[PDB]
C-alpha cells in the first residue's frame, strides 16, 4: 500500500576541523542511494535509482546536493562558534527527510533534524522551527537559518514538489523489485528447553510464524525481531519455552505471500 521515501543523513563533527557526512536512501525497506563522505557524487544502489528523471534533471538535483553538503558543514561549524561555550564538539547531527505516498496523487513530506540523538528541529510549512522538548538555545540557530530566504524556497520546493514527483517516478521504475516475492526457508533447533523456528530468505516483510500442536496454535510463542540478510531478504525466529520431553508432535507453520497457498510445516 503506502511506501515511504527516506533520505537519511548522518554527520559527525569531531572537533573544530574534522567532520564527515554520509547519507543513504530508502524506499520502504530497499536502499536506492548511498552517498559517502569521500565521494564527490551520489551512488545508485539500484538500476532504477535515477527514477523517471532525465539526466539534465538528475545532474541539477545532484549538484544542488553537492553544494548543500559543503554548505551544511561550514554552517554547523559556524553555528557551534555562535553558540560556544554553550555547545561544543563532538557533535552529531542527523537528518531524516522525504515523503510518504498515498492513493490519489496524495503525499506528506517531512524534514526532521536531530542533535546528539534527540529530535529537535524540523522544516515545516515555510520555515524551520523547534519541536516540543527542544532546548531554548536553538532559538538563535533557528532564527539564523530562517534569515536565509533562498534556502527556504529551495527546501519548500524539494518537499512540496520534487520529492513526491520523483518518488512517484521511482515507484514506476521499481515495480519489479518493489513487488518481488522471495520464498522463506525454515529450520528447527533448541537450547535451554526452548524450541526455535528459523525463517529466512523471505520478501516482503509481512510473515506469520506460529508453533502448533496439530491444529492448536501454541499461544506461548515469541516472535523475534526482523533481522535483515545482505541480499535484501528478511530473517525472523519464533521461540517456545517447553517442559523437556514435550517436543513430540509440535510443528512450525509459516505463512508467506511468496508461498502461493501451500505453507511450510516442520515437525520436530
Amino acid at each position, epitope marked *: 500500500k503506502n511506501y515511504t521515501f527516506r533520505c537519511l543523513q548522518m554527520s559527525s563533527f569531531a572537533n573544530r576541523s574534522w567532520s564527515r557526512t554520509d547519507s543513504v536512501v530508502w524506499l520502504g525497506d530497499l536502499q536506492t542511494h548511498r552517498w559517502s563522505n569521500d565521494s564527490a557524487t551520489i551512488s545508485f544502489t539500484k538500476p532504477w535509482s535515477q527514477g523517471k528523471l532525465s539526466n539534465q534533471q538528475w545532474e541539477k538535483l545532484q549538484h544542488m546536493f553537492q*553544494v548543500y553538503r*559543503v*554548505s551544511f558543514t*561550514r*554552517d554547523i561549524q*559556524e*553555528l557551534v*562558534k*555562535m553558540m*560556544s561555550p554553550k555547545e561544543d564538539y563532538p557533535i552529531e547531527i542527523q537528518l531524516s527527510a522525504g515523503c510518504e505516498m498515498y492513493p490519489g496523487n496524495a503525499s506528506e513530506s517531512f524534514l526532521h533534524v536531530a542533535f546528539q540523538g534527540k529530535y529537535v528541529v524540523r522544516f515545516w510549512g515555510t520555515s524551520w522551527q523547534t519541536v516540543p522538548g527542544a532546548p531554548s538555545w536553538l532559538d538563535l540557530p533557528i*532564527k*539564523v*537559518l530562517n*534569515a*536565509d*530566504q*533562498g*534556502t527556504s524556497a529551495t527546501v519548500q520546493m524539494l518537499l512540496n514538489d520534487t520529492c513526491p514527483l520523483f518518488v512517484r517516478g521511482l515507484l514506476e521504475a521499481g515495480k519489479s523489485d518493489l513487488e518481488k516475492q522471495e520464498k522463506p526457508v525454515a529450520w528447527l533447533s533448541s537450547v535451554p528447553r526452548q524450541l526455535v523456528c528459523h525463517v529466512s530468505g523471505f520478501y516482503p516483510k509481512p510473515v506469520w510464524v506460529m508453533w502448533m500442536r496439530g491444529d492448536q496454535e501454541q499461544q506461548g510463542t515469541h516472535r523475534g525481531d526482523f533481522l535483515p540478510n545482505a541480499d535484501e531478504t528478511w530473517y525472523l525466529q519464533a521461540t517456545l519455552d517447553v517442559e523437556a520431553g514435550e517436543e513430540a508432535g509440535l510443528a512450525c507453520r509459516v505463512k508467506h505471500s511468496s508461498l502461493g497457498g501451500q505453507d511450510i510445516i516442520l515437525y520436530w
Partner: T-cell receptor
Amino acid sequence: AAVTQSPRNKVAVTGGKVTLSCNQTNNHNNMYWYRQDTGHGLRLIHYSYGAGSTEKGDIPDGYKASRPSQENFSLILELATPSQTSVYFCASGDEGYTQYFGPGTRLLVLE
Amino acid sequence: TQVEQSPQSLVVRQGENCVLQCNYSVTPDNHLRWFKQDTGKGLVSLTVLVDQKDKTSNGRYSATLDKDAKHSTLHITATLLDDTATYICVVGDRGSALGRLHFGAGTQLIVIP
C-alpha cells in the same frame, strides 16, 4: 544603522601596541574586522558573534581581537609591523546578510 | 581570487557611458553587491542583486547578474566628475549572517571633467 571607528588615522612604530576600536549602537550580535590593501579585496581578520567571542578569520596572524561588549569590537596589534600598514575596516550586522561598514581607519607603522 | 573584476582601471570623458565587469567562481552565490569607494573615503553600497538573472538600478547606475554565468555588470549612464572612484564587487555566499563576503579588488574609474 551606523558604525564608528577610532582612531581614524594612526602613525605608529614597530613593536608598539596598537589598538583599533569599533563601536556600534544597533545592538548587532555580529562584528567583523577587515584590512584593505591595494590590489586585493578586503580580507577578514577576526570576527565576533557576540559579547565574549572572537573568531579567527582569514588572515588572523599578528592580530588579537576583543569583544568586551555588544557595543565594542576592538582589534589589537601587540607588536606592530611595517606589513600591518593598511586601511582597516570594521563591520557589524544582525542575523541577515548585510554588513554595515565603518568609515575605515588608516595605520602606518614606521621603522 | 574568486572574484575577478575588469578592467583594472579606465579613463572617460565626462558625459560618456561606461560598463564594469565582475566575474566570480564563488560557491554558492546568494547575492552580489556593488560598492563605490572615493579615494580616501569608505564603502557606499550602490545596489545588490539577488536573483538568477537579475537587473537593478539606482539613478544613473544600472547592473545585471547572471548566476548561471557567474557574471555581473555595472553600467553608469552619463558619467559625472564625482564618479571618479574605485568600484568593488562583492559576493555573499549565504542569505544569512553565516556567510562570508568575497571581495574583488575593484576597478579604478577616472572621469575627465
